[PDB]
């Protein structure tokens, strides 16, 4: 994917003024170097490959950190987690995608387990991760039947096994995911992307039966987008994010702080 080259130009002195236009139209004055300066002739090499959407969102980043604390005593009644799925929880990522109104793509999920030891030894740990779609039964105990997973998609990780990973087809019941959404509920409530982006929940639960060591499992979640398309670009974000599925920004007794630096005077930068 190439960039045009720059042609040599010459001292014009014409009746036509390409430099002069009117931005009122809403068009970006199409003027090029040549038209304004006796220019050289250059054979540009430069390539825009990298600037492709596929190269942009084509990088894996983190979207969630799920910390699970093991508890000896009542083992089978806890030691499990849940999670409302979405990208809305981690600036870095979110800021990007929130660069377009609508987007479509498949996803590559990658997991990263970390066992923080609390006794002198760890023993043998084994996790399980189940994808529970909206409508499916949520687990409620480290021993709930749901973890049988007769149909949901689960992935098992044990200690010393390389990071797991899997691919996911574009979900949603639409043509694309809604990054934003000026709409409500059928009960005029919940203004926001929350109104739609219900992908279900992601749960984990230590499998290893009752044992002797207190430990902490911290599984981070990474996500790369593949086969992409996006529509209607939007201006990028400017203030720290506060809450999921909402644009809100005003924060508890603190000034509205952008990223624009200030200066003393405009006749010196």
């Amino acid at each position: 994917l190439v960039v045009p080259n720059i042609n040599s130009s010459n001292p014009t002195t014409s009746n036509s003024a390409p430099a002069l236009d009117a931005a009122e139209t809403g068009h970006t004055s199409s003027v090029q170097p040549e038209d304004v300066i006796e220019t050289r002739y250059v054979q540009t090499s430069q390539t825009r490959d990298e600037m492709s959407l596929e190269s942009f969102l084509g990088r894996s980043g983190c979207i969630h950190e799920s910390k699970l604390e093991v508890t000896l005593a009542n083992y089978n009644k806890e030691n499990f987690t849940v999670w409302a799925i979405n990208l809305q929880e981690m600036a870095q990522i979110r800021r990007k995608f929130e660069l377009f109104t609508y987007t479509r793509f498949d996803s590559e999920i990658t997991l990263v387990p970390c066992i923080s030891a609390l006794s002198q030894d760890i023993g043998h740990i084994t996790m399980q991760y189940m994808y529970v779609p909206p409508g499916a039964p949520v687990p409620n105990s480290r021993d709930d039947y749901a973890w049988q997973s007769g149909t949901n998609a689960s992935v098992f990780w044990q200690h010393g096994q390389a990071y797991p990973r899997f691919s996911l087809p574009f979900l949603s019941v639409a043509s694309a995911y809604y990054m934003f959404y000026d709409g409500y509920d059928e009960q005029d409530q919940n203004y926001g992307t929350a109104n739609t982006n219900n992908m279900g929940s992601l749960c984990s639960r230590i499998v290893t039966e009752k044992h002797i060591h207190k430990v902490h499992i911290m599984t981070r979640i990474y996500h790369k987008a593949k086969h992409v398309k996006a529509w209607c670009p939007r201006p990028p974000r400017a203030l720290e994010y506060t809450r999921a599925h909402r644009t809100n920004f005003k924060i508890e007794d603190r000034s509205i702080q952008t990223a624009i630096v200030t200066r003393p005077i405009i006749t010196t930068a």
Binding site: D49, K226, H227
Partner: peptide, 25 residues
């Protein structure tokens, strides 16, 4: 099948759409 970039081989080993690597342009 193998191609040119910015040669090499690459067939999709997986039976499904999504599993494939990154797209082309």
């Amino acid at each position: 099948a193998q191609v040119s970039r910015q040669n090499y081989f690459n067939i999709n080993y997986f039976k499904d759409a999504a599993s494939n690597g990154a797209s082309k342009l």
